[PDB]
């Protein structure tokens, strides 16, 4: 219950930020946001150790980039990161300085290629199929 | 593939 409440709050925040970036960068390709959301939510619930000493928005941006990668939608990480900066609370250190291994820090692209994408590759690849995706419910409010 | 061939700049 406490944890369920906590996750509800986290999902609401996460989705709101997701929706803002998507409405802005994936204006065309509206089917993607709900897929990106499914990957993002799966990561928070099932691969939560990726959150340890990290930031929710790092998981968010990595999810956007990964889905658009399978969907072969041209969307550079730089473009994502540049759009990310316009979020009110957004700070560039969040993408320029990310925990990689034990106490090594690098850009979000390094975190993506070396940690996130390694961990979620099979989950992400499932979106390469033409079958109807089984999507996560969009979080309330 | 899923690799990102970008350098943050």
């Amino acid at each position: 219950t406490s944890l369920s409440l906590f996750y509800k709050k986290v999902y609401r925040l996460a989705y709101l930020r997701l929706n803002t970036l998507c409405e802005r960068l994936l204006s065309e390709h509206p089917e993607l946001e709900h897929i990106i959301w499914t990957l993002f939510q799966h990561t928070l619930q099932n691969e939560y150790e990726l959150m340890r000493d990290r930031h929710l928005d790092q998981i968010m941006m990595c999810s956007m980039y990964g889905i658009c990668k399978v969907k072969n939608i041209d969307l550079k990480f730089k473009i994502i990161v540049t759009a990310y900066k316009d979020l009110p609370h957004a700070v560039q250190e969040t993408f320029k300085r990310v925990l990689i291994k034990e106490e090594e820090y690098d850009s979000i692209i390094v975190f993506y290629n070396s940690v996130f994408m390694q961990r979620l590759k099979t989950n992400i690849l499932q979106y390469a199929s033409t079958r109807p995706p089984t999507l996560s419910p969009i979080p309330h409010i | 593939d899923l690799y990102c061939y970008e350098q943050l700049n």
């Binding site: 906590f6 709050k9 340890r52 000493d53 990290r54 929710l56 | -």
Partner: protein, 177 residues
């Protein structure tokens, strides 16, 4: 400004729990009065020493004064929450008191200007987070700017501080999942 009006009232409020609060304390299967008073006193000592190191002047009175405003806000909010409602459990809960007190202190720090206060009270961000929304709901004198500040503190905890190593969150995920 409702925050300014609040500081005025706190400035005139007494330093110890009201008679109403005390009544609730006496209704507790395990009376929390002495531990509540003791906590206030222990934290006062820590806060003033830490505030003085930070700002200077070998144990500042400004720090002592800020702390008093915080404790008064803390008793006020505690009072309204209890009034709007196992008080023994609640009133005997360490997390409840320490988080409510820190939230009261954060509001005072923010008006006379966020995790600094957590370090000061040795409070884990996840434990603190639990009281934010309730405090906001229980305190009618918050300005829109203070509500956004508290909401921002909550978001910072949800986005990163609650996920720092050693956070009680991971222990909770593991047991549920």
């Amino acid at each position: 400004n409702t925050i300014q009006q609040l500081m005025m009232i706190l400035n005139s409020a007494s330093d110890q729990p009201s008679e109403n609060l005390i009544s609730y304390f006496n209704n507790c299967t395990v009376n929390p009065k002495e531990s509540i008073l003791k906590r206030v006193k222990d934290i006062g000592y820590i806060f003033k020493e830490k505030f003085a190191k930070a700002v200077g002047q070998g144990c500042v009175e400004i720090g002592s004064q800020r702390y008093k405003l915080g404790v008064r806000l803390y008793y006020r909010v505690m009072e309204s929450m209890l009034k709007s409602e196992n008080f023994s459990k609640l009133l005997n809960d360490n997390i409840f008191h320490m988080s409510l007190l820190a939230c009261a202190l954060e509001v005072v720090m923010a008006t006379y200007s966020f995790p600094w206060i957590l370090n000061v009270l040795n409070l884990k961000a996840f434990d603190f987070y639990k009281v934010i929304e309730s405090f906001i709901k229980a305190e009618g004198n918050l300005t829109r700017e203070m509500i956004k500040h508290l909401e921002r503190c909550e978001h910072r905890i949800m986005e990163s501080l609650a996920w720092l190593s050693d956070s009680p969150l991971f222990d909770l995920i593991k047991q549920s999942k």
